[PDB]
Design a protein around this motif. Sequence first.
Motif, mmCIF file in Angstrom:
data_model
loop_
_atom_site.group_PDB
_atom_site.id
_atom_site.type_symbol
_atom_site.label_atom_id
_atom_site.label_comp_id
_atom_site.label_asym_id
_atom_site.label_seq_id
_atom_site.Cartn_x
_atom_site.Cartn_y
_atom_site.Cartn_z
ATOM 1 N N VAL A 1 59.928 16.453 -16.993
ATOM 2 C CA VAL A 1 60.962 15.540 -16.520
ATOM 3 C C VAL A 1 60.271 14.347 -15.876
ATOM 4 O O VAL A 1 59.422 14.518 -14.995
ATOM 5 N N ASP B 1 58.055 14.407 -12.305
ATOM 6 C CA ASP B 1 57.409 13.177 -11.857
ATOM 7 C C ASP B 1 58.465 12.248 -11.273
ATOM 8 O O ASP B 1 59.334 11.754 -12.000
ATOM 9 N N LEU B 2 58.387 12.010 -9.966
ATOM 10 C CA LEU B 2 59.242 11.045 -9.285
ATOM 11 C C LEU B 2 58.412 9.989 -8.565
ATOM 12 O O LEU B 2 58.868 9.386 -7.591
ATOM 13 N N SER B 3 57.190 9.761 -9.036
ATOM 14 C CA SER B 3 56.285 8.831 -8.378
ATOM 15 C C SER B 3 56.768 7.394 -8.533
ATOM 16 O O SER B 3 57.484 7.051 -9.477
ATOM 17 N N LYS B 4 56.366 6.549 -7.587
ATOM 18 C CA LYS B 4 56.694 5.131 -7.606
ATOM 19 C C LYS B 4 55.409 4.324 -7.515
ATOM 20 O O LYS B 4 54.574 4.579 -6.641
ATOM 21 N N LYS C 1 59.120 5.331 -11.465
ATOM 22 C CA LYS C 1 59.470 3.918 -11.468
ATOM 23 C C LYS C 1 58.197 3.094 -11.348
ATOM 24 O O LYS C 1 57.370 3.349 -10.468
#
Lengths: 58, 58, 58, 58, 58, 58
Positions: free
Chosen positions: B41, A42-45, B45
């Motif tokens: 992981v 998960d790298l969502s913003k 943000k």
Amino acid sequence: GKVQIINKKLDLSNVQSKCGSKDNIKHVPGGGSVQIVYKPVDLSKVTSKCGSLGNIHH
Amino acid sequence: GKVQIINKKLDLSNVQSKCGSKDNIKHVPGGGSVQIVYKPVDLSKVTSKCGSLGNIHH
Amino acid sequence: GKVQIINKKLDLSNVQSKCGSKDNIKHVPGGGSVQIVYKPVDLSKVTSKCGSLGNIHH
Amino acid sequence: GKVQIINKKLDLSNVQSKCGSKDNIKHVPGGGSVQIVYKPVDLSKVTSKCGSLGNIHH
Amino acid sequence: GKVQIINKKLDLSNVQSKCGSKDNIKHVPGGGSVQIVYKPVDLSKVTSKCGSLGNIHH
Amino acid sequence: GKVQIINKKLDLSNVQSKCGSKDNIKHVPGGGSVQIVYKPVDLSKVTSKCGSLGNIHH
Ligand SMILES: Cc1ccc2nc(-c3ccc(/N=N/c4c(S(=O)(=O)O)cc5cc(S(=O)(=O)O)ccc5c4O)cc3)sc2c1
Ligand SMILES: Cc1ccc2nc(-c3ccc(/N=N/c4c(S(=O)(=O)O)cc5cc(S(=O)(=O)O)ccc5c4O)cc3)sc2c1
Ligand SMILES: Cc1ccc2nc(-c3ccc(/N=N/c4c(S(=O)(=O)O)cc5cc(S(=O)(=O)O)ccc5c4O)cc3)sc2c1
């Protein structure tokens, strides 16, 4: 008012289950297996900006 | 007012379960297995900015 | 007012369970096993900024 | 007022349990096992800034 | 007023338990085992800043 | 007023327990075992700053 909802789910309901059983068995040499590998990234913003603003002349 | 909800779930309900059973068995040489590998992981943000602003002339 | 909720769950309900059983068995040479490996990594960032602001002319 | 909630859970409810059982068994040579390895890493950052601000001209 | 809650839990409820049992058994050569390895690492940072501020011209 | 709560728990409720049992057994050559290894590492930092501030021109 403002309402915001984000759902990311893995749901397993009623898997290899019995309900209201009235059965007759003699021999059960074998069962059931559940194998789950849960490796998400998960790298969502998520961004929210609220508020009035005036004059901009950069 | 503002409401914000974020859900990331792994749910397992009623897996290899019995309910209201009235059965007759003689031999059960074998059962059930649950194997879960939970390696996520999270680099997400979440940002919230509230408040009025005036003049910008960079 | 503002409400913010973040949920990251691993839920296991009613797994290999019995309810309201009236069964007759003679031999059970085998059972059930639950194996869970819980190794998550969390690098998430949560930020909240509230408050009025005036003039910016960098 | 502002409300903020963060939940990171591992829940196991009703696992290998019986309720309202009226069964008859003769031989049970085997049981159930629960094996949990709980090794998470948490490097998350939570920040909150509240308060009015005036003029910025860096 | 401001309310902030952070929960990191490991909960095991009703695991290998009986309730309202009226059963008849003759031989039980085997039981149940619970094995938990709880080795987490926590490097999280929680910061809160409250208070009005005036002029900044670095 | 401000309220802040941080919980890091390991809870085991109703594990290998009986309630309202009316059963008849003849031989129980085997029991249940609970094995817990509790080795966490905590390097978390909690900071709170409250108070008004004036002018900054570093
Ligand atoms: C003090 C104490 C200590 C230990 C203890 N253990 C208990 C217990 C009670 C019930 C259990 N049921 N286990 C199972 C299992 S399995 O996972 O166990 O193989 C697989 C099934 C597959 C299907 S189906 O796909 O054909 O539809 C339908 C029903 C199933 C089932 O009902 C397992 C364990 S009570 C207790 C009390
Ligand atoms: C197609 C097929 C083919 C073969 C087959 N065999 C089956 C079967 C099922 C159950 C069996 N229980 N066998 C035994 C035996 S023993 O005779 O096996 O040594 C000795 C015991 C001593 C004590 S105590 O003195 O310590 O109180 C208490 C209980 C005992 C018991 O329960 C033995 C065999 S199903 C099947 C299906
Ligand atoms: C898809 C897939 C495939 C394979 C797979 N295997 C899994 C798994 C999960 C947990 C396991 N725990 N194994 C153990 C073992 S051990 O003998 O079994 O090494 C010995 C222990 C001694 C003590 S104490 O005496 O010092 O108090 C306390 C706790 C112990 C423990 O927790 C072993 C295996 S998940 C999975 C998923």
